Amino acid sequence: ARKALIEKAKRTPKFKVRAYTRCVRCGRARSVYRFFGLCRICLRELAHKGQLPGVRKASW
Amino acid sequence: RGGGKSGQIDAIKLGIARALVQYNPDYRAKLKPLGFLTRDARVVERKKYGKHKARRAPQYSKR
Amino acid sequence: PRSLKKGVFVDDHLLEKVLELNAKGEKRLIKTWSRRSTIVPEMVGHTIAVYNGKQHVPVYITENMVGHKLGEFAPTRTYR
């Protein structure tokens, strides 16, 4: 988002309840699958580029 | 093992029908046309996205 | 039906300030931005100015309103 608004970088957030996520790739603050640390949009991009090892198109 | 009692009924039914054929292979004549040998491959259908429930489609307005 | 367990809460910068003014006389008006703070019995007297996102308000402080939270007395929105 706003480059400024990565005060998620603020290692001490004062209270641990001001701690939030953000996509480590794009900054997105709103679908950040915590396993990957990536947002939903980045996840699909990386999944398709085959740079998420083991991750695959899933159908059943 | 598994599922729910009414399917367990149908599954025992297949179980019996099969034992009773490897006990006397001739029994098929008075057993196969009844259908007891076939296995009911009718299984719960997967939940599809953008549906509510596999086929139940969400309700819409204005058309 | 609210929530103050075996803790009870009053934001303290405002508290050390009011108890301080209980060594003598009552300061007319105290500028607070913490509506967060419950009212203690030791507040019954000095008129506190609760903020609003827009304006401190002259909230006089009766004993009939002790257990209540400050912001319960400075309405936020404006209506008709």
Binding site: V24, R25, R34, F35, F36, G37, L38, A47, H48, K49, G50, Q51, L52, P53, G54, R56, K57 | - | -
Partner: protein, 206 residues
């Protein structure tokens, strides 16, 4: 709408993962991030070599980066004083001791990432797009290949209204899994916008 990533679709079979390691649900997040940093320091500095892909593998703490470039000349340097600098510049971001390898690309005109990458650079050097594409395809078709297809996005030629230019010959059978269709996307940062270059290259079957 339409058309999934022809890689991510075939990811199951005919194409394997760029980075292929294993990690638990407390590690995966971290290895992935650092894995990315490597690709970033790599795709920027190795442009000249024209890097098609970067395989990354991990194990007992160590990391086996296996860079695929057309011209391994530019990654070696003074007979070494470059592959050392870069295996060094990786040692800082990766505290875990890296191992840089270099893979020749026999046929740059049979790796979609490079073909597209080629076209991209021309569009910035203001080449004629239509030809670039018909040509690019031919250079790929002349190099064997069962088929191939290229696509440039929009604002061809500074043209105010974004368009799309095409070209493709041979078979490019997108809906068949049993394919092997190297795909490659190149960006083209021109003076008046951006353009996207997609390149498809069919080869083999089973």
């Amino acid at each position: 709408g339409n058309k999934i990533h022809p890689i991510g679709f075939r990811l199951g079979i005919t194409r394997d993962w760029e980075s292929r390691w294993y990690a638990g649900k407390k590690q995966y997040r971290h290895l992935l991030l650092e894995d990315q940093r490597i690709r970033g320091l790599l795709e920027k500095e190795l442009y000249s070599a024209g890097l098609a892909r970067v395989d990354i593998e991990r194990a007992a703490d160590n990391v086996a980066v296996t860079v695929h470039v057309a011209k391994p000349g530019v990654v070696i340097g003074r007979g070494g004083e470059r592959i050392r600098v870069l295996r060094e510049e990786l040692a800082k971001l990766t505290g875990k001791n890296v191992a840089l390898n270099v893979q020749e690309v026999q046929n740059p005109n049979l790796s979609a990432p490079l073909v597209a990458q080629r076209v991209a650079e021309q569009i910035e050097r203001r080449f004629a797009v239509r030809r670039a594409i018909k040509q690019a395809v031919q250079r790929v078709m002349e190099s064997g290949a069962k088929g191939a297809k290229v696509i440039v996005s929009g604002r061809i030629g500074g043209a105010e209204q974004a368009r799309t230019e095409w070209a493709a010959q041979g078979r490019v059978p997108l809906h068949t899994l049993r394919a092997n269709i190297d795909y490659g996307f190149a960006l083209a940062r021109t003076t008046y916008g951006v353009l996207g270059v997609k390149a498809y290259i069919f080869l083999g079957e089973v």
